[PDB]
Symmetry: D2
């Protein structure tokens, strides 16, 4: 729990997540996607339970990335919600929502949902 | 635009969102929830598109709140993904995911999904 | 109750849902969508709790529509999960998932999520 | 595509799905869950694209199960939306929504979301 979130993680698509977990609940770092209208690293910010468990539970966390950087602006943002489980093979299991900015006419089809599993391998 | 988003907003459950949109695309503030094992204000952090399209398209954004403060700890975190629509009646329409920490065993039932609409209060 | 659900309903996008709830918990009917690459009516099938609680709790149900009929094929399917609330103004509040067939390559972007509220029409 | 959906599939939790895909788009069968306030088989009904692809795409499908049978009534329903991909190792990749019947007071927390991958192994 805690500390252990800090590091570089990769998900099944090959995207890389580099985070620092702060003693009080903050999550800061950068994200580089392997898919999308993404190009380079994007800033990410989130929050986690700094006091999880003590039944063998995971540590709830979440973070956001607005897909805009010095190279591209996809006019979308993705949020990942999930939990961290440490151990010999630590992982972060997440479900994400990706919203694109649309006109009201296309608001019904603005959000994609998926799931990503990140490991340090 | 940072401004448009900066302000106090409320949603249909009676919760309060106080946010400041920074020039760099950052979102920081506090959230007061009307439901759940929540008590007092919680810190929120998010990101938004500081350069949206010039299209009556909404401005994409998202933020997270881990439900732990100095008074309560619910061992859960919520992320909201949506867009801000400005105008006379500005709104932030979102869909959210609430994940609870659980044992591997109950992980299948760790996440709730819903939707919230926030209305800005200002004269 | 089967009845309560049986009828014609419309949602905020202007789509039409005609359903019959059978005694065994079955749902069958047709759906007319106001959006997407849809044209005409599509067949729908679902299930609902034919023995709900006796609690002003809603009646859980869900249904699917694959968007293929004799006129169009969008190579996608939508499932709606929600509950029916009866009363003077009966409503079915749902959250839906729309999955498109894609290549493994674009599977990450195969599913959309949203929410729909249906209002029953009847005098 | 088509036909190939018919059979017995299992997901990572150990739940079993037995379906018959009908020439015109219907999906019928039974489901036995490994988790929840479930007990025995429950009836399931759905729809699939009977005419998918011709770029190597999967076959979109979805189905519902109301968790009520002769033994238990959990007052909930689950819908799975996803696509079938056949081949040497066929699978059905899905995301699901589980709604429980609640009073309006708890409507905000009525729906769970997850993902399941089913194989014939
Ligand atoms: Cl990614
Ligand atoms: Cl992306
Ligand atoms: Cl809230
Ligand atoms: Cl519709
Ligand atoms: Cl299952
Ligand atoms: Cl279940
Ligand atoms: Na809330
Ligand atoms: Na629709």
């Amino acid at each position: 729990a805690e500390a252990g979130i800090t590091g570089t993680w990769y998900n099944q698509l090959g995207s890389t997540f580099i985070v620092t977990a702060g003693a009080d609940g903050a999550l800061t770092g950068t994200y580089e996607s392997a898919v999308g209208n993404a190009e380079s690293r994007y800033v990410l910010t989130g929050r986690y339970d700094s006091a999880p468990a003590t039944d063998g539970s995971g540590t709830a966390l979440g973070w956001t990335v607005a897909w805009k950087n010095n190279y591209r602006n996809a006019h979308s943002a993705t949020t990942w919600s999930g939990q961290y489980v440490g151990g010999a093979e630590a992982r972060i299991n997440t479900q994400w929502l990706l919203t694109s900015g649309t006109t009201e006419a296309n608001a019904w089809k603005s959000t994609l949902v998926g799931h990503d599993t990140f490991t340090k391998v």
